[PDB]
Amino acid sequence: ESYSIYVYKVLKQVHPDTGISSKAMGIMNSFVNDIFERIAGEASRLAHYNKRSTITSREIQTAVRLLLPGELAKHAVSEGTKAVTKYTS
Amino acid sequence: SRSQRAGLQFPVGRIHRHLKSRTTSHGRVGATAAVYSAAILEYLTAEVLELAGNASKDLKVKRITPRHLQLAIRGDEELDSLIKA
Amino acid sequence: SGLLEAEEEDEFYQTTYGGFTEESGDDEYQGDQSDTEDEVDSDFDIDE
């Protein structure tokens, strides 16, 4: 895949004036990829377990609540809901 | 581009491609799931990079470095648990 | 909470994502491999 450009875009969002090395974004690539893997795997696990062949806002939200520790789970669920509203709307 | 539609700097589209790649037989992924994953990823990266730029005594980092990343996550003990999970 | 994790070993971090320690030969990330633009397939707008 390739997400380093969007990693830098998010860095600008949080820090419009912050640079970052090559291996640091490699570490971000690994971190985002592994969390992305965790979320997608949990969502597909729920979908396969349920009759839902689909992975939806329900699936990703439940996975986010299950995996993330507390306040992190709350923030991630809120952000996912907000972005789902943005994209669907 | 679907990314900006979600207000997410990250690619909801390529993300959904990856999701499809990581589903079960006939296992589909909704667009809402794609954008939800992209949004949680953007927020996690945003917090991590926020603390990485702030991963220092002066609370600003010129270049984000692996060490700044360890400080951002580890010091963000929520992220410490999340990554260690 | 900052010092409590420090007194103990952070071996997990030491081996996370090729390590979290500062290294050499770490250029300020230049840019994409010519794949920055996002991409989809035909089945994103499929109903849920």
Residue numbers in the entry:
A (entry chain O): 35 to 123
B (entry chain N): 18 to 102
C (entry chain K): 18 to 65
Sentences from the paper on this structure:
The human Tat-interactive protein, 60 kDa (TIP60) complex, a fusion of the yeast nucleosome acetyltransferase of histone H4 (NuA4) and switch/sucrose nonfermentable related 1 (SWR1) complexes, is involved in both histone acetylation and H2A.Z-H2B histone exchange and is essential for cell viability, playing a role, among other cellular processes, in gene regulation and DNA double-strand break repair. TIP60 can modify nucleosomes through covalent and noncovalent mechanisms by using its histone acetyltransferase (HAT) module and its E1A binding protein P400 (EP400) chromatin remodeler subunit, respectively. TIP60 consists of five modules, including TINTIN, HAT, TRRAP, ARP, and BASE, each with distinct functions. Within the complex, the EP400 protein functions as a major scaffold, making interactions with all the functional and structural modules, a role similar to that of the Eaf1 subunit in the yeast NuA4 complex and of the Swr1 subunit in the SWR1 complex, the two subunits of which EP400 is a merge.
With the goal of structural and functional characterization of the TIP60 complex, we purified the native, endogenous complex from K562 cells that had been genome engineered to produce a tagged version of the enhancer of polycomb homolog 1 (EPC1) subunit specific to TIP60 (28). After tandem-affinity purification from nuclear extracts, biochemical and mass spectrometry (MS) analysis showed the presence of 17 distinct subunits. Our structural model of the endogenous TIP60 complex does not include the trimer independent of NuA4 involved in transcription interactions with nucleosomes (TINTIN) module, and only a small segment of the HAT module could be traced (EPC1), as they are flexibly tethered to the rest of the complex. The TINTIN module was expected to be flexibly attached to the rest of the complex through the EP400 N-terminal domain (NTD). As is also the case for the yeast NuA4 complex, the HAT module is flexibly tethered to the P400 subcomplex through a previously identified region within EPC1 (49–54). We found that our reconstructions did not include density for the transformation/transcription domain-associated protein (TRRAP) either. TRRAP (Tra1 in yeast), which is the largest subunit in the complex and is involved in its recruitment by transcription factors, is a major feature in all structural studies of the yeast NuA4 (49–54).
